Amino acid sequence: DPEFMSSVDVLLTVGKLDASLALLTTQDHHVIEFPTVLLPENVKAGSIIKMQVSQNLEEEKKQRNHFKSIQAKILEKYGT
């Protein structure tokens, strides 16, 4: 899938942790505030996670077609 060739694979280390946020560190020295509830179940602290960031081009045209129809509907009802 064209999305796979442009996919981005990262490794991050789970640092100081809250109920709210985990702070994640990369080897290129990015520090990221991340929702702890989105991390997997056993994730603990001092642990290592893989983030596979891919795109979606179907949902983009989906949301585009939704937006246009909504706006056209509003224009249809109120105003002209």
Binding site: D18, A19, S20, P35, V37, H66, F67, K68, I70, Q71, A72, K73, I74, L75, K77, Y78, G79, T80
Partner: protein, 589 residues
């Protein structure tokens, strides 16, 4: 209008003031200090011309001097003595004064007007409450010599536009813009109150060629002039047409996206406040949130939309995700020289030498939901609005489902929860004893507090009742203000429900007339209370009395007041409120 209404502070050394101004220039933010006059402050002077200021001083001295105004487009301080006209910089070193004088007067003028409107706009929720005693206040719409003031503001607008973001924004706006800022708010407010449309339309359409993003301002100006259809078509033009400024050759992500965010925000707020239709409103509000997730207004809207949707499961999460303002404060007048005063009495009724100083229930006055500021208040409102539909235990059932794969409540919200517990406690502990007692009293202040508590919780006539009670044993500005607000709310309710039955034509007419008369009677009292405290200017009072005018002929409205009140009082209400609508509203009737 002479001597009376003019306070002053004793001068411990002559020229204690301007020195204490000069030093404190080094810590002036936002819209800055009020135009100090040596000692008493002032608002609403017409600053657009030094000849006109010399006229002001001419009248002022004729009846019976260093005046010091300020602009924050550029942080300097215009002093004039009667003609020593000069400047104090942020550095605080002095200067001297002689198109860049005209633009100085222009800037100080527009900044002045911004201050004078926004002091009465950001302080609406506490009823235009005035902390400083010493401040005299003019209706700014009235001070014109040779210049129709609002028309000047409109004509002087695009010169000082583009410098607007230096004036920052209302405290609920986290990310200021050329669109969102104090200046544009002042503009649309002035245009709304004056109904001075076809000038603003011309000026803005002139401005659109050089700056295309001010079509957002044109849209807000439309909505204020009751022209939704033009605004809606315009919105669709901006958000869909390829020719629009949002679709561009050189596209900034952020700076265009905040304008898309603002447009979708306007669209959703329009869809919600009028027109019901929570589905389309939510569908827009989600996109708006996506465009500006760091903004308060988007999440605020989405949360409100969820309520009407009737699912609070989402409202709670989208209330938690709502960003709060931890720094910016609402605009108040701050004193230059903190510290035996002077209090003249106009009145050409109500006046107690001792105010309050009477015990109150420790669990009444110590409720911390009162005095809540900024975003926290506006969130707590949505909270009470929710608990109205759910009830406490059902609310907790929703709460303990998603809070502590759940997520952490952001705290401020938990604080709001405890506050809701306390307010509900007080409400129940009041209304139980009240019911028990009402088979077979309480201080006016207690009625104020209880009414405010019920109004917080969303029990409107149960609060109007209490305010009406407290307004028997005394005069209270808070009671009169809130009661008047209740009457405006009921007027709106009845009129809105008249178009969409339930009530009948006769009932509608009678209720409308009773409400109108009660509205007038409530206006005059508060206007008087503001006159005794130097204030000739109120936006809310103008709004209310305007509503009566729409319902009934202005001459007829004048007659009712002339009858039921004295003659100099009728002259007063003619001046501070009705001379306006008669003339300054551009023949809107």
């Amino acid at each position: 209008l002479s001597q009376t209404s003019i306070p002053e502070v004793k001068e411990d050394v002559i020229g204690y003031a301007l020195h204490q101004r000069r030093a404190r220039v080094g810590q002036f933010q936002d819209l800055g200090p009020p135009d100090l006059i040596t000692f008493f402050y002032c608002m609403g002077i017409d600053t657009s011309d030094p000849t006109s200021i010399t006229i002001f001083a001419k009248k002022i001295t004729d009846l019976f001097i260093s005046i010091s105004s300020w602009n924050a487009f550029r942080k300097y301080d215009v002093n004039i003595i009667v003609v020593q006209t000069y400047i104090i910089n942020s550095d605080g070193e002095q200067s001297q004064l002689p198109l860049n004088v005209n633009m100085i007067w222009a800037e100080t003028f527009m900044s002045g007007i911004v201050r004078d409107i926004m002091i009465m706009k950001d302080n609406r929720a506490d009823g235009e409450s005035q902390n400083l005693v010493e401040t005299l206040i003019f209706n700014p719409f009235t001070s014109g010599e040779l210049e129709d003031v609002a028309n000047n503001f409109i004509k002087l607008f695009p010169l000082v536009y583009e410098k607007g973001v230096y004036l920052d924004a209302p405290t609920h706006v986290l990310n200021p813009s050329l669109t969102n800022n104090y200046l544009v708010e002042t503009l649309v407010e002035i245009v709304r109150l004056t109904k001075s449309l076809e000038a603003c339309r011309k000026m803005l359409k002139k401005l659109i060629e050089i700056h295309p993003e001010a079509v957002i301002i044109l849209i807000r100006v439309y909505f204020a002039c009751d022209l939704e259809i033009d605004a809606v078509d315009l919105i669709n033009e901006q958000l869909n047409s390829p020719s629009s400024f949002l679709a561009d050759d050189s596209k900034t992500s952020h700076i265009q996206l905040i304008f898309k965010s603002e447009l979708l925000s306007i669209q959703s707020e329009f869809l919600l406040d009028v027109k019901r239709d929570y589905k389309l409103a939510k569908e827009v509000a989600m996109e708006a949130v996506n465009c500006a997730p760091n903004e308060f207004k988007t999440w605020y809207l989405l949360t409100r939309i969820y309520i009407k949707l009737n699912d609070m499961s989402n409202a709670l999460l989208s209330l938690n995700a709502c960003p709060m303002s931890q720094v910016k404060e609402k605009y108040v007048l701050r004193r230059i020289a903190p510290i035996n005063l002077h209090l003249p009495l106009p009145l050409d009724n109500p006046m107690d030498v001792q105010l309050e100083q009477k015990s109150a229930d420790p669990n009444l006055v110590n409720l911390s939901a009162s005095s809540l500021k900024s975003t926290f208040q506006l969130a707590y409102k949505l909270l009470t609005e929710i608990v109205q539909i759910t009830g406490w235990e059902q609310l907790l059932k929703y709460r303990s489902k998603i809070f502590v794969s759940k997520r952490l409540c952001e705290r401020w919200l938990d604080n709001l929860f405890m506050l809701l517990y306390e307010d509900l406690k007080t409400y129940t502990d009041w209304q139980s004893e009240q019911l028990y007692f009402d088979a077979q009293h309480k201080l006016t202040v207690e009625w104020e507090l209880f009414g405010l508590c019920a109004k917080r919780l969303g029990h409107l006539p149960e609060a109007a009742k209490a305010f009406q009670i407290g307004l028997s044993q005394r005069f209270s500005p808070v009671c009169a203000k809130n009661l008047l607000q209740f009457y405006i709310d009921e007027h709106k309710r009845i009129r809105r429900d008249s178009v969409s039955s339930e009530l009948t034509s006769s009932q509608i007419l009678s209720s409308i007339n009773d409400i109108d008369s009660s509205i007038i009677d409530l206006v005059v009292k508060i206007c008087c209370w503001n006159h005794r405290w130097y204030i000739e200017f109120s936006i809310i009072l103008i709004d209310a009395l305007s509503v009566a005018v729409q319902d009934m002929g202005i001459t007829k409205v004048h007659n009712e007041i002339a009858s039921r009140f004295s003659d100099p009082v009728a002259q007063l209400i003619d001046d501070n409120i009705l001379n306006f609508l008669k003339n300054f509203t551009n023949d809107t009737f």
